[PDB]
Design a protein around this ligand. Structure first.
Ligand SMILES: N[C@](CCCC[B-](O)(O)O)(CCN1CCC(O)CC1)C(=O)O
Ligand SMILES: N[C@](CCCC[B-](O)(O)O)(CCN1CCC(O)CC1)C(=O)O
Ligand SMILES: N[C@](CCCC[B-](O)(O)O)(CCN1CCC(O)CC1)C(=O)O
Ligand SMILES: [Mn+2]
Ligand SMILES: [Mn+2]
Ligand SMILES: [Mn+2]
Ligand SMILES: [Mn+2]
Ligand SMILES: [Mn+2]
Ligand SMILES: [Mn+2]
Lengths: 306, 306, 306
């Protein structure tokens, strides 16, 4: 059992400074030792340095840093593809969530039947035509879903991307802040999700049962876990750019990670949006980073019963 | 869909200064825009100024401000009655919970088959003969329930009140601090309630299902939601006069409000007992008021999924 | 209905100073008045002073204060036995969890068919051959279980102890920090437990149902509740020596206690590991002690509905 750890310090998917220090904060919270102790063989790729693009002007006077996000994702995809081909489960540390464009593309390159569990307060499925922010970290899923491509225009620096998964192959968990055009998209393409409300109704156990039945109920598939730290309640994960009240509890987050581990199918994991600079204190930053480590470790077999 | 907003800054239902600033606090937290965004057509009656009563002596050397509370409610009932008769769902902002005497009386004046969902840490059903505090905010249900009336003496300033709710038409959610004579009343009159213990057992989904079966299971009825902010855990709503540990989570409160909205029957709502002065800090005051706005917005259609 | 309250200010079952002040903190938080209010007839034994042992050297260069813990427990067992024989339900305030060796031995002396509910973040079932800390508060169950006696060496000061519980007669609730030898022990002897994970899945109501089915499903037995304050999440019980994130909520703790009371079979209760010195503020110390009084009171009949 081998795990590749990749630092992807990207910030250009949004506008708030500091998310680029996420990977370092997560490492400092003891990630590598935690994974080693579970018996993971580790390759640390370090923090990547992405090639910048000069004069990376607004696309359509709205989408910010499109070429930089495109190129950095192209490079990240390469590293992820290569690491999966060498037999590593891939852990990518963010960084803002636009890097899932790169990790999922790289992952799907030779694992085209992968499925995605997207744990997040947000759906991240705005297209360039629906986003009201221009921030690519709120759009990553739109570039990945094949049913959507007639609705997704061609961004400078994005041409290397080819929609790799079907809308039946991603399930959301934790939703609570969804833009109206994203609601439309989720309903219109019948994309399955479990909002905080569904968790309130069903309980996290049934949510995971139904998630897996939908994705791997009839066949084994490599799992991509894309975990936005803002899925957790802001009291637990304050150091993040877009906190939304009413999130997952600590126990809920661990249970999700546990069930991910229990499938035996986890092939890649994104842990994104930890921004240590947004914490009002050092303790707030460290608790967020510690929580990130707990998720990753539980995803690779750390249990609550020894 | 039309909504009337009425500020009722009453404090004389109890002894702690500051609850009369509840309405201003809730408005400052952005109530009106939130309602507008949902598509509510809004009529703001502003904050009412209630007529004072000279020489409003204790009743029976115990009950404080009887005539002031009586008259203020009479005046409040008039405003509520008029707004509901003009087609408005009526939102009343408190103020202590004694104002439910006026809002429920006024609501019933136009919609006599109304039922009541009472969300509260407390039962508020003491009578003038059982109260150990003398505070009218802990007695309002006693003046409203038909079955209790031969046990409720006539208070100065209360003679205009016609008890308008049968004991089978009110359901409590959130109970955890109930005086022994209130417990006797609840059992003797077979009044239904879901205490925090019941919520622990059933979960909030089943609690709402059963609440609606009891109230509107046989026929459609207009719903009065009387929501005491102290129903929420003190950690979430610190700025209130009688906090009690072990209350509703944020998610539970939202789920209650959502199910209220989903019936299509909400006709009036009280949001009471927000006291900004009892906050330890301005942060605690704003989070309590923000929570109040979330309850109201959710009750009129705000969802956690877009 | 008679309750004996025994202060057991012991600290030598572990290495952190201050847990010996647990009983006083709990008394200061109003324990006696709370029990009286429920109709408990009270005998206060005050805080016991345990006989010290000179030159109490490490056993096997690892196990700390063995003779001191052995002797204090022998003395405590005598007091508990006498109180139980005199017809008292026995409340023992700690002090570290090694005192359960004494309370359970004393209790079993007159009620040999007793069963045990162990509420705790930890399993406390290391033996002198498996412990990595050397701290006896993490081993008390090992001295009590009949099935383990062939794997438990004889310690100085421990010779009076006669294992009195079968492995089918103890249930754990709340586990989340279990050493690998303890996990082996639990599975190997088929000791039943409900980890935090089980609680996330089942809900606390189902957990208590199954707990009682296992222990008293066939016959009525006197119940010993051994409650380590660290079962609660550290946000609620911060003043304790070995806190572990992701614990019981307030409501879960009350629910557990309420069910214990509802059996009518509660015969003895330990409330251990309150260490007021580990609080970073007096408020933190007080809320922990307040929480301890809530558990005890609820175990003897305090309700959330009056
Ligand atoms: N839907 C958002 C989501 C941002 C969070 C991205 B993440 O990776 O962290 O989940 C936010 C849209 N929102 C619309 C209302 C405005 O007031 C603020 C931006 C967007 O920018 O598209
Ligand atoms: N039962 C109470 C209710 C207070 C809360 C009113 B509300 O609108 O906020 O729900 C409190 C009675 N309690 C009796 C014990 C005394 O120590 C304190 C007051 C009362 O004053 O009648
Ligand atoms: N298993 C522990 C239990 C301590 C808590 C006892 B209690 O009464 O409070 O439940 C802890 C073992 N742990 C092993 C890893 C070390 O780094 C820390 C101690 C032990 O010391 O044996
Ligand atoms: Mn995201
Ligand atoms: Mn997000
Ligand atoms: Mn109340
Ligand atoms: Mn009230
Ligand atoms: Mn213990
Ligand atoms: Mn413990």
């Amino acid at each position: 059992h081998s795990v590749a750890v990749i630092g992807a310090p990207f910030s250009q998917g949004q506008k708030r400074k500091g998310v680029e220090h996420g990977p370092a904060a997560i490492r400092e919270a003891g990630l590598m030792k935690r994974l080693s102790s579970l018996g993971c063989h580790l390759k640390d790729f370090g923090d990547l340095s992405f090639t910048p693009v000069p004069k990376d002007d607004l696309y359509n006077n709205l989408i910010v840093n499109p070429r930089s996000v495109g190129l950095a994702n192209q490079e990240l995809a390469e590293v992820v593809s290569r690491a999966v081909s060498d037999g590593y489960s891939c852990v990518t540390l963010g960084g803002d969530h636009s890097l899932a464009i790169g990790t999922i593309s790289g992952h799907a390159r030779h694992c085209p039947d992968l499925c995605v569990v997207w744990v997040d307060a947000h759906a991240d499925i705005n297209t360039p035509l629906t986003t009201s922010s221009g921030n690519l970290h709120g759009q990553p899923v739109s570039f990945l879903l094949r049913e959507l491509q007639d609705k997704v225009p061609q961004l400078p620096g994005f041409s290397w991307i080819k929609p790799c998964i079907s809308s039946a192959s991603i399930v959301y968990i934790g939703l609570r802040d969804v833009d109206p055009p994203e609601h439309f998209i989720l309903k219109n393409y019948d994309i399955q999700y479990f909002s905080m409300r569904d968790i309130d109704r069903l309980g996290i156990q049934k949510v995971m049962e139904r998630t897996f039945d939908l994705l791997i109920g009839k066949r084994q598939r490599p799992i991509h876990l894309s975990f936005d730290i803002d899925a957790f309640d802001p009291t637990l994960a304050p150091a993040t750019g877009t906190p939304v009240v009413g999130g997952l509890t600590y126990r809920e987050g661990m249970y999700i990670a546990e069930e991910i581990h229990n499938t035996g199918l986890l092939s890649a994991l994104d842990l994104v949006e930890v921004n240590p600079q947004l914490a009002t204190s050092e303790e707030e930053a460290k608790t967020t980073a510690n929580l990130a480590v707990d998720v990753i470790a539980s995803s690779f077999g750390q249990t609550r019963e020894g």
